[PDB]
Amino acid sequence: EFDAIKIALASPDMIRSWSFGEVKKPETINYRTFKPERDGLFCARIFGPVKDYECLCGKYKRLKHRGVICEKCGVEVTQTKVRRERMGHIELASPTAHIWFLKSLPSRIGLLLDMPLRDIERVLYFESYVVIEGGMTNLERQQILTEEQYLDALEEFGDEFDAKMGAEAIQALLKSMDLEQECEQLREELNETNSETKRKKLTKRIKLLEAFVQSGNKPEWMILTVLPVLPPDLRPLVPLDGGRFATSDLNDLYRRVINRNNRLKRLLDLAAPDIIVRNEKRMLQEAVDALLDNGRRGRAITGSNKRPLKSLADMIKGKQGRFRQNLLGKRVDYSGRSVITVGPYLRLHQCGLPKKMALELFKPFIYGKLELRGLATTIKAAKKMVEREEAVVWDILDEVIREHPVLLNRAPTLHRLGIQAFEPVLIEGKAIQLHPLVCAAYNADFDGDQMAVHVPLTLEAQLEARALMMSTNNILSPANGEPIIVPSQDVVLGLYYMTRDCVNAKGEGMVLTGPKEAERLYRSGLASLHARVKVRITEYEKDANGELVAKTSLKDTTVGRAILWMIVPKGLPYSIVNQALGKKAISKMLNTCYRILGLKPTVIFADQIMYTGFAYAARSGASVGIDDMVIPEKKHEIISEAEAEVAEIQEQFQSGLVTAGERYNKVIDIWAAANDRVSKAMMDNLQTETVINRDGQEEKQVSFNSIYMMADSGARGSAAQIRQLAGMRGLMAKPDGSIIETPITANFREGLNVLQYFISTHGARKGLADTALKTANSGYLTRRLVDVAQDLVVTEDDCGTHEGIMMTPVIEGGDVKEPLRDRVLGRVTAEDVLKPGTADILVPRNTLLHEQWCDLLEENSVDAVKVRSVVSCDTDFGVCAHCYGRDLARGHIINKGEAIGVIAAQSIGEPGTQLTSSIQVKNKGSIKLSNVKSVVNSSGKLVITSRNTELKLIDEFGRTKESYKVPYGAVLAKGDGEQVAGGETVANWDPHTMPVITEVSGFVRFTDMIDGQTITRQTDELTGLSSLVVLDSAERTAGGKDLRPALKIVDAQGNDVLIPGTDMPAQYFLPGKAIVQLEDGVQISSGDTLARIPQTGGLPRVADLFEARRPKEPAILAEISGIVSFGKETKGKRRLVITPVDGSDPYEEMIPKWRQLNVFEGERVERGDVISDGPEAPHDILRLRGVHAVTRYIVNEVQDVYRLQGVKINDKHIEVIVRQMLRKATIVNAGSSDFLEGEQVEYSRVKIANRELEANGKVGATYSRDLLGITKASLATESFISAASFQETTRVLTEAAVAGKRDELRGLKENVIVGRLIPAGTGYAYHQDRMRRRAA
Amino acid sequence: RRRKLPATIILRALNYTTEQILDLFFEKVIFEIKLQMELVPERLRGE
Amino acid sequence: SQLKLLVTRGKEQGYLTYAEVNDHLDADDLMLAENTADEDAAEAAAQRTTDPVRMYMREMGTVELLTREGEIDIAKRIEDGINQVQCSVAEYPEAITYLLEQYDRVEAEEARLSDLITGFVLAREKFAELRAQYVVTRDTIKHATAQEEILKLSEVFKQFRLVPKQFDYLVNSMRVMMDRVRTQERLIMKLCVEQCKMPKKNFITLFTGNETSDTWFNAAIAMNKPWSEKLHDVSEEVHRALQKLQQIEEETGLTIEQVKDINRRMSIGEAKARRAKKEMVEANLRLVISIAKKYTNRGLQFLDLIQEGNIGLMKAVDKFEYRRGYKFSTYATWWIRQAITRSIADQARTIRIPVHMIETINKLNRISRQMLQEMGREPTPEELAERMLMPEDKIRKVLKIAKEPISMETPIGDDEDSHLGDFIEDTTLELPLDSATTESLRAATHDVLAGLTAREAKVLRMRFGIDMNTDYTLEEVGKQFDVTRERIRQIEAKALRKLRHPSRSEVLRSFLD
């Protein structure tokens, strides 16, 4: 209807235009007749009649004569709702400053006038005068003149002198101000001499003057002359039961403003002393300030209840304002709630709805049906029929409900599966029956939880619920590809018990004809559910283009597996059910069914699995008793032995042989070992049993114990819970985080005594508090993540880009913890996947890698692919479907319009509550060295001559399996190009002192070495050797301080030995605190040690890693490639200069001397190398290394937090957030564009700006990408309606008003506030068509 | 819990002179004249 | 400096404590704390009490109290002022004529004799003497001896004392007459000087000294100067202004320079009165603030009380005389108390209560307190009426006053910070089922009314405003149908009878109830 919203400042003429009349009296209503007063806050003349079509007096009280203004009253005869739309105005006697434009942090008034805020405040409060265009009389504009100074200046000046006080002075200043001429003057200033901040401040001044000139506002509009009055019905005075009333706080504030204004107007007629009028004007300013914003400049005015009054500003901001409490979430019609029960008889797509709730929610539909079918004549008859609950009413209700989805929702909606659409089934009672398989999606248990039910109304809403939100459409998690409809705890136990063989059961050794005979035998009592038999099984294979060829063969199975085979669909093999079928086997089975067959067979299969599991779990009759918790028979011996060892340690400490800090650890280790022994003994005794037999001999088998069965199948429990039940409760902690030495040696089968229970309580209280805190934090993280990345939408099919990420498996030193299949499945290749033999292309390009392609890649053993990624997408304002991948919840390539930002935010935030030397090879392969320079030492072996050496174990198949990091100068047993066996330590080194080593051998002379200037005399008394320890710069004398210890290599012939392969002299400038051991003239072998130089986690790690915080001590990277050099020393921090090979060297950094540098001044380093060592910074990687390196550092550094806790989410969702982090570009060269040199612009704008410009006959502009946090990157929103929702409302509206900003609703958070279709999903087509017609 | 003030102020507010304050909170050593000092063995724990 | 250290500490730690900020630093403290939180930049880093009451106290402080004699001088000053203006206005002729005409009208029983005049320095006799003097002086304007006659007339006029209202009316009338003269003079000056650059010297030489004839302007047009030639274009407006001035001269009967001097003396006296009054009030501000501290918790804020007290003092200082000898602190406290009490009774509660009802409520409260203390338990409305002499219905009515409205934000949820305003429903909205019922009734009426002869349908739609813009009577529909108010009634009755019986109107019966 409008398609855009504009905001600006209001002129007094505009304010008089809005109003329908002036409010002159502070009266509200008569205390006797309760009628609106005349010219008061509630006035019928100004704001409209109080009841529909009726004058106040009553002479005109019918619709027939509407639109007429009664002469007696003046009240127009119209609808009363018009009182909700009409404003008034109050003409202030004297101008008042607007608090938003005075006490804002930038202080718009002061910024525009170029005056300190304190000067403005003191002139406002009638403290000192101000000269306004004084003239040529030796006065300076905007000069403070206190009362005495003003008085003595007035003398000797017959001129007016133009001095004023109060807000009138400010208004005169603003009105006299000229913006174009001052902008010209500032341009002249910027043209001339420039200083560090002079140029910046002048540029800011000119830019903001230009902005204010272009906004269309005028400065003097910041000073109020007329005050608008809100319509009465938004600040109502409403009668409550009895003689009492309730009123809004705005009535009090308006009454105060009007009282003081009228008093001032009266006072200005009496010609009162200036003291009185000054005080009155100060009070008027204070009252208007309190009205517009109460509690911002001074003390908040309070009411009778002694609480601060709510002002106009308080009604907009906060979590209880119109922007948040009512515009983004509000109460809804056609809704209900109730407690949820099980209902295990249901199908996956339907729920159970009480008849009473269904009758109440669908009332209009039932009225329509009753009238249509002729049962009722009018709607009143239908109402009475439904109110009496006749017989026909229930048939009509059953007809209405037939195919009408209802949305069920549970209160903590953490992801999109917390709302799902089901088909109702009318039931008796008052509880909602919820299908078991969906509980995990809701995180719902049946111990008192409640659910809300909403009913879609429109045809479009019903179709969306049926096609998008149905429960049979969401069976895969959207965070990863895994199903979320897995059977949970009792289905698992039933299917485990059914498929679980026994050694010598009834009917063992039989040969059945198929599943039917197996079931017929079991059900008639002739065979046991686990009796090993031979069964003829017929299974189908898709060994063709979908043909399902059959194969019949005699399998060796049990009766349970043969029975369970009856429910498995055609395409699957028989080996899926031919096992014990724990918790994870069932999930694998469902995943296999989904990938091979499709969606419908999977849903049918899941329902059959649930039914069979429940039936046979009931059949088994599995229970829990006190004899199932078998305590080990050796527990007392183990505890006694631990007691003896700890007592011996204590008495040894009492003899002063060990420090307490070590005996504590010894006792802790003793008790840990004892606990491990007890747990091992318990589990050994509890997981096996002896049975007999086919012939009569003792034979072991896995136990049928009930606790063990529950833990082993994954139904419920673990080894820790069993350990506490039958082992020992373990080792408790303390409030300080310490671990109390003596553990709880009792389990729960045995009782705890009072002290052990006291310690347990210590633990439990902390557990509860930590749970609460985690739930608190994980919501804030999700809210920020949604705010930053809400408006991302797939808005293209292919951008055509040829770039992407390089996906390879993740290896933490030893084993691999994420194969290539997990990281590559479902993505789009950016380049041909050449065969590892380099023969031909294996996967051409732009091919969505589904399961078959992943299997092919695994078969050919490729370990590196190039996959298109979101962070390297060429689409402007959105993403393309090919650079994203596939949906992960539907299984196909993502659809256009899908909102991927909200999905990414929800997927990242949903699991938040859950989360809290020598090198030895391990496999028979071949050593491969990457990024290392080799050389042969004196011993003849190979020594590393590099800092970034990487060792890989390339097996006979050419696949990496072990990646290891080796420091500098390590002796290697083997090298590249030689096969090795297992268990061979191919590298070793000393992890102590310093790795400073030489490179050649020969006579060493102390060149440029003077005793008493750089070294100290410290002879090795123990060995008798003389060692020259190099002191520091401070201690040493200045005679040779600038000199450094250089040890040149020479021969016996008197010549000079230089670095082999080059003419560079071989000198080693050793640093301070270096212990020179070998004397001059003593030949040294290659690599000799010249000097023995001495020396978070959980959610907060993720939250501080999306905020791009800089660590405490960031490792210094190589800013530029070139020879490293040094400059002036000890100028607060050690100075280092890098000189490129040819390029200029304007780089110099004050590197602190505290950092232990790992590079010598004679060693060149390229950019991106580490100078110091420590945690890396996120900003430095982006600058030194491309975008693909900072994203790789993040998607791997936050995925480590989740992997530890077992949470798995796709990498798609972390690259969506990163794409929104590095979104602003900083320009370095303007080029032929229209961009300022030092400016930050949206990277999308600059990318397209120079793109079209380059195509023409111009040259594009360079830039440097920038990285922000999710909280700083969400403040760059270009709409002031979405920004005010989650930012400071006062700041956003104050800056948008002066700038004359207008925003066209283009986001998801703005069309919700306005109340129109979002541009993301089903509303994507509507918005595109609107833009097309609008362009025309 | 208002703006911080040096502690000794309050002592002066209780009508205490500087000599009295030092007497209360500190011990003293003496000297005699030439330039002879009365040594207390316990005091010189580190010297 | 000190702020810089606190900022450095906050940046290093990212947070600060109240003690650290307060030490390193009421309204000024709050302002500084707000500024510090700005960073969590340049403006805050670079960056009295702001209380309107403290600044008022400061501005009042620079004052000197007055001793017993310190008022007397001021008092006499005031008298001189007023006396001067009296002598300034005694010379105005039209004033005495207006006084006599008003007195004659009063004698015509249009107003009370005493209301006209507050006595003199007997009323009928003094009026007769005044009339005799006026008649003997007006008929002797002949210049040589007329001045002494007018002086005697004014001197005898001095013996009279005039009501402030009519004296101020005469002053305002003289002021508006002088304003008209000055406006005409300013128009002449603007049309002659700015439009023609007419030198001020010529204006002084010609305009001043006579200021009655047209020689100063009309005869100066032939001075042989460019301004004289240019005055031809604007001669019409200047001539009209001169004619108005000549007409006014007849009313004034005096030289305009004398009028200017009289007005100058009047302004000097008024300024003296004003300065004296200001000096008096500045001293008495302390008394005003001292009185107005017994009404703190009454609905008005302290400063409003102070300002109302200041109005009462300014009224007293104008109505105070030193003849009685009341130490101001006794003639002034009464006015201050009156003003403060009336203001509290006029602008202290949102639903205004008249003054008399406020007094009744206060009296009832005092009686209730006395009764509660005396009898011990409580007074009941019957006992209150007996002790208070009221019909026992007025007592109940006064007790039923609506007290004070509840703030609509009073936290009442106590569970989710809910406010009292969230639980108040809109009682005027029409239920969606009633709207559907209305539409269904309209449809049923449209269906039924089509089942009778077109004339009957038209008549029924004409009488009852069914889909019509407005209702109509019998004679109007007769004008429409060319019949006279009788056949129309018969056809209407026939149609209603036809719709009356069932088989034609049964769903309407369903709508009925």
Ligand SMILES: CCC[C@@H](C)[C@H]1CC[C@H]2[C@@H]3[C@H](O)C[C@@H]4C[C@H](O)CC[C@]4(C)[C@H]3C[C@H](O)[C@]12C
């Ligand atoms: C902390 C929540 C306070 C809130 C629950 C308390 C505080 C004052 C109470 C109201 C007032 O008495 C005025 C009315 C008196 C009538 O008799 C009954 C209604 C009425 C609104 C009262 C209901 C309730 O009791 C109130 C709102």
Ligand SMILES: CCC[C@@H](C)[C@H]1CC[C@H]2[C@@H]3[C@H](O)C[C@@H]4C[C@H](O)CC[C@]4(C)[C@H]3C[C@H](O)[C@]12C
């Ligand atoms: C624990 C929270 C109490 C809350 C549920 C109860 C306690 C007092 C109740 C209000 C007061 O009576 C005043 C009004 C009376 C009108 O008749 C209906 C509205 C009105 C606001 C009442 C609605 C509600 O019922 C209130 C808030």
Ligand SMILES: [Mg+2]
């Ligand atoms: Mg629960």
Ligand SMILES: [Zn+2]
């Ligand atoms: Zn009226």
Ligand SMILES: [Zn+2]
């Ligand atoms: Zn793309």
